[PDB]
Amino acid sequence: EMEKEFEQIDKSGSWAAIYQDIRHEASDFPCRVAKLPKNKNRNRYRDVSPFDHSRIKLHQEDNDYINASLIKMEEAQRSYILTQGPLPNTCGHFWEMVWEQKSRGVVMLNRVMEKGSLKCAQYWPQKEEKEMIFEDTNLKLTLISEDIKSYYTVRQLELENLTTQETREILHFHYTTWPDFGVPESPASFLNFLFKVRESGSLSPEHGPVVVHCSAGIGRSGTFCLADTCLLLMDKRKDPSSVDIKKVLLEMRKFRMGLIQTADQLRFSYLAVIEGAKFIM
Numbered sequence: 001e002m003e004k005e006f007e008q009i010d011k012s013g014s015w016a017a018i019y020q021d022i023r024h025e026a027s028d029f030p031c032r033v034a035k036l037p038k039n040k041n042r043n044r045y046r047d048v049s050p051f052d053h054s055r056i057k058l059h060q061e062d063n064d065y066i067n068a069s070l071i072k073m074e075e076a077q078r079s080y081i082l083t084q085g086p087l088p089n090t091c092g093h094f095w096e097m098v099w100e101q102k103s104r105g106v107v108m109l110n111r112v113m114e115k116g117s118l119k120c121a122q123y124w125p126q127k128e129e130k131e132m133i134f135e136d137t138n139l140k141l142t143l144i145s146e147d148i149k150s151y152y153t154v155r156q157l158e159l160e161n162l163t164t165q166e167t168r169e170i171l172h173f174h175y176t177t178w179p180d181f182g183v184p185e186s187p188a189s190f191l192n193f194l195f196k197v198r199e200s201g202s203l204s205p206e207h208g209p210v211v212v213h214c215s216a217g218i219g220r221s222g223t224f225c226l227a228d229t230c231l232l233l234m235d236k237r238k239d240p241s242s243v244d245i246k247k248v249l250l251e252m253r254k255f256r257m258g259l260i261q262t263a264d265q266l267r268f269s270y271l272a273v274i275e276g277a278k279f280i281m
């Protein structure tokens with residue numbers, strides 16, 4: 001079991017070493033589309049590049065590229081799209097992807113400002129009465145409502161295809177308390193946030209994949225998906241104890257790089273899966 005394993009690593013002080021084995025085992029696929037000169041302005045510096053095979057394609061004729069990847073977890077029956085925090089010039093693209101992929105939810109695991117530096121564009125409206133128009137992709141976006149809680153905020157947004165006048169309700173799940181340095185001391189609030197995203201229907205099969213992002217190059221998104229999938233598999237399988245977080249991570253890692261960026265994030269993932277499992281089971 002996983003708690004046993006966790007403890008073997010904790011007292012043995014081998015987090016760094018176990019983390020490094022996984023990293024060497026991990027997949028390495030081409031990212032040629034991402035490295036094309038015409039796409040240089042579509043990529044966030046110090047951020048991951050999407051593998052070609054799993055990249056999400058915008059449905060426009062001009063340039064179909066966005067830094068986003070589809071993680072498809074076959075056994076768990078979950079899909080997630082992981083993407084970079086929108087850039088000043090890719091907000092239209094971002095919401096285009098949300099529209100076309102039929103996503104219900106967007107999961108944001110960073111603040112707009114962290115460490116005194118901008119981590120993404122203000123890509124959603126902060127006020128009901130001041131909507132946003134993305135002229136490049138023909139979308140309007142409106143803040144419908146906003147509910148600020150201690151560890152996270154949930155917003156309802158409406159997206160309008162300006163040409164056809166169709167509308168879609170999107171839920172924005174904004175985790176606002178991940179510390180600037182390290183990981184949360186207790187996974188409790190993060191698990192609670194995951195349960196709120198679940199409760200919304202945003203991870204469920206009736207919708208397209210949730211869109212998940214964080215800040216550039218420092219993970220978090222992978223932890224959210226890893227924890228979600230592991231907990232789901234523990235409920236599905238005849239043998240819950242066969243769920244190996246390393247194996248689930250390695251499978252996820254086939255679809256996008258930089259899922260777990262440090263030994264501490266790995267430790268935190270174990271910790272979230274264990275306490276999440278105790279709470280559900």
Ligand SMILES: [Mg+2]
Pocket residue numbers: 053
């Ligand atoms: Mg394929």
